[model samples]
Target: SCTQTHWGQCGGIGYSGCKTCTSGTTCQYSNDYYSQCL
Candidate 1:
């Protein structure tokens, strides 16, 4: 799975911004037209 992270505003680890994933929460592609982080 992919990690979703945006700067230091993510509960995950290693990932940042709309870039590639790192750790923590998995970042998946959404069908809502936007794949934003929580």
Candidate 2:
């Protein structure tokens, strides 16, 4: 819950959140487990 501008939900496949990604956005990894914050 930190995607300050857009894109959130930074995880999946059992993801719990809190992966961090608010300033400028980052954490991209989509696949096999999911991961997004771009």
Candidate 3:
């Protein structure tokens, strides 16, 4: 429930939140400074 949703940020350089995704989405890096639940 507190997990990141689809396309939601899961990782980042300055991010410190839920590094997990909801449902079928998974975390993927789009850039070094950004990552999202894909």
Q: Pick the candidate with the highest TM-score.
A: 3
Candidate 3 lDDT by residue in tens digits, 7-38: 87766667766778888999888886678888
Per-residue lDDT of candidate 2, residues 2-35 (tens digit):
3334465556656564668778887688674666
Which candidate do you rate higher for TM-score, 1 or 3? 3
Local distance difference test, per candidate?
Answer: 0.41, 0.64, 0.77
Return the candidate ranking by TM-score, descending.
3, 2, 1
Better of 2 and 3 by TM-score: 3
Clashes of 2: 0
Tell how far residue 28 is off in model 1, in angstroms: 1.5
When summed lDDT is taken over every stretch of 10 residues in candidate 3, the lowest stretch is 8-17
* Model 1 Cα lDDT, one tens digit per residue, 1-38: 33435422233334344445456544344543444343
TM-score of each: 0.22, 0.29, 0.66
What lDDT would candidate 1 get against the real structure?
0.41
Better of 2 and 3 by lDDT: 3
> Can you give the lDDT of residue 38 in candidate 1?
31
